Design a binder for this molecule. Structure first.
Ligand SMILES: Oc1ccc(Cc2nnc3ccc(-c4ccccc4)nn23)cc1
Length: 275
């Protein structure tokens, strides 16, 4: 109902996909989230179609807001099929699996570049006052040109790897090993807590997808961090990039670099490498 919407009525025509335009292939699964499976689709362009099972006014507004976001390093929304979430197909899947995959071998320069692309995507999102809440390598994806896109947000938001989410008093399922100290304490999320997660993501990139804090159990991470601890420097992580990570994990949220600063600092480090 258009009356239930604000003044975003004129935008509904652009976000809605007619069921005649979309072919969905329920015999080929390309992701399993807690809210539903995602399937190959044809819209002629290749797409990913997300099922939602395991207010309509609010669902449409979320889609309208999301479709307006456009950056080469942010996963776009193609539209909603009245429902089914229609996303661009990502040939190379999520970033964590890609870097753990022994088929491909990114160089250190390639890995830093993935980091830089994430930073640009987050710089965009931050400029729109959008807090991600769940930035991690598992939640970024690569397309056919190996272009990295910040994903897992808006209508695409889900837990795509349940192992890394812990049940809280609140009952909330939280990615504790990617969370800023203050978020673990208050469960509030800010752009500055996204910056903390970004630091962990950089660590993931430089270890080619190692799990962070393996010998720490769940919410004991707060105890671990408060002992005066941070993730160790990976072998092939350049010294200045480790300094960047430590800045992302500053105990004072407001002292952490902006995503704009991260793009600048990382572009510089990236530029020193060949191949
Ligand atoms: O080709 C595509 C496939 C799935 C999606 C949905 C989606 N949106 N955001 C995210 C973030 C992570 C993952 C994901 C998928 C598999 C394994 C681990 C994580 N999926 N995802 C979009 C396009």
């Amino acid at each position: 109902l258009s009356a239930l919407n604000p003044e975003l009525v004129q935008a509904v025509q652009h976000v809605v996909i007619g069921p005649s335009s979309l072919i969905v292939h329920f015999n080929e699964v390309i992701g399993r989230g807690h809210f539903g499976c995602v399937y190959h689709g044809t819209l002629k362009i290749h797409c990913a179609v997300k099922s939602l099972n395991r207010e309509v006014s609010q669902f449409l507004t979320e889609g309208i807001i999301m479709k307006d976001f456009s950056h080469p390093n942010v996963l776009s929304l193609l539209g909603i099929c009245l429902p089914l979430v229609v996303l661009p197909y990502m040939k190379h899947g999520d970033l964590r699996n890609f870097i753990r995959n022994e088929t491909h071998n990114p160089t250190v320069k390639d890995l830093i570049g993935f980091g830089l692309q994430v930073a640009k995507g987050m710089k965009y999102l931050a400029s729109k006052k959008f807090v991600h809440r769940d930035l991690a390598a598992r939640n970024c994806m690569l397309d056919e040109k190996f272009t990295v896109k910040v994903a897992d947000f808006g209508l695409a938001r889900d837990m795509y790897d349940k192992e890394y989410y812990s049940v809280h008093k609140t009952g909330a399922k939280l990615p504790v090993k990617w969370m800023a100290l203050e978020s673990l304490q208050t469960q509030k999320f800010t752009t500055k807590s996204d910056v903390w997660s970004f630091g962990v993501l950089l660590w993931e990139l430089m270890t080619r997808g190692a799990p962070p804090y393996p010998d720490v159990n769940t919410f004991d991470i707060t105890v671990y961090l408060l002992q005066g601890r941070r993730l160790l420097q990976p072998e092939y992580c350049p010294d200045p990039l480790y300094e960047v990570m430590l800045k992302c994990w500053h105990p004072k949220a407001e002292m952490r670099p902006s995503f704009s600063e991260l793009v600048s600092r990382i572009s510089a480090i990236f530029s020193t490498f060949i191949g």
